């Protein structure tokens, strides 16, 4: 399959309750592999997957340092967003960063990211070309100016194209047994009468990895997008995910409906009905 590696920063100011909290999580696809949290008793990069444990002592010291430096920078950043947006020092604010790389099956770059958000709205994003920025407003334009001035996009591209893809390839190899295994969903259709004359068919998918899945109800072979109730894909706790789609159908009509399952662990897309 295709793969990705992402790092997600969250920096959260908390006036009156100490210095902003800085949190870093690193994911290969939908597996968390590494974490850093400035509130930990001893703030350090910590392994969250077995296959990253086999990284040497230097790795952890280098990676912790990056994260301790970033803690400061991202705290510098919140103070800056305060000036740039003429806000007061009494409110709690959030800066987030997602950056990383997608690789094709062959293992080379498909796309790279480096974007930030301030209080849950877009601030600045590295464009697909990895040499230009999209600033969201006049505040983030100041950052853009600064970032062009100091050849940042260029450094991202050297990373996104070199280290990102190379470490991602080493990770997928060391964690081959899990990272390159797709677990198919276990599927069944449940039948819950509601009125005398209306029933709930719910299509389940359980125990699948990765998270990406398509679940669709059809009536006489037609999409029922607007009659279908769809829950967000949810983690089980054992690395796997769950999802359901549901339709409310009239009684005696359960056989006009079919559930459609698409997922990367399945050779064929599944068609399933309600069975007695």
């Amino acid at each position: 399959g295709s793969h990705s590696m992402r790092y997600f920063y969250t920096a959260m100011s908390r006036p009156g309750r100490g210095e902003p909290r800085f949190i870093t999580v690193g994911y290969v696809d939908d597996t968390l592999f590494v974490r850093f949290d400035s509130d930990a008793t001893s703030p350090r990069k910590e392994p969250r997957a077995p296959w990253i444990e086999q990284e040497g002592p230097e790795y952890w010291d280098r990676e912790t340092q990056i994260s301790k430096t970033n803690t400061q920078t991202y705290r510098e950043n919140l103070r800056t967003a305060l000036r740039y947006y003429n806000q007061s020092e009494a409110g709690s604010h959030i800066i987030q960063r997602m950056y990383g790389c997608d690789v094709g099956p062959d293992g080379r770059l498909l796309r790279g990211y480096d974007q930030d958000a301030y209080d849950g709205k877009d601030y600045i994003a590295l464009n697909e070309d990895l040499s230009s920025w999209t600033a969201a407003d006049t505040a983030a334009q100041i950052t853009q100016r600064k970032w062009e001035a100091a050849r940042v996009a260029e450094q991202d591209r050297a990373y996104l194209e070199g280290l990102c893809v190379e470490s991602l390839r080493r990770y997928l190899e060391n964690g081959k047994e899990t990272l390159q295994r797709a677990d198919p969903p276990k599927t069944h259709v449940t039948h819950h009468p509601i009125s005398d004359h209306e029933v709930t068919l719910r299509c389940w998918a359980l125990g699948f990895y990765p998270a990406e899945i398509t679940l669709t109800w059809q009536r006489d072979g037609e999409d029922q997008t607007q009659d279908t109730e769809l829950v967000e894909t949810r983690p089980a706790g054992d690395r796997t995910f769950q999802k359901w789609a549901a339709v409310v159908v009239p009684s005696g009509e359960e056989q006009r409906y079919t559930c459609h399952v698409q997922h990367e662990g399945l050779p064929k897309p599944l068609t399933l009905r309600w069975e007695p």
């Binding site: 990056i66 994260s67 430096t69 510098e76 930030d116 940042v152 990373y159 280290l163 470490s167």
Partner: peptide, 9 residues
């Protein structure tokens, strides 16, 4: 592996 130190806003 992470990129080096991130840059100021």
């Amino acid at each position: 592996e992470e990129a080096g130190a991130a840059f100021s806003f």
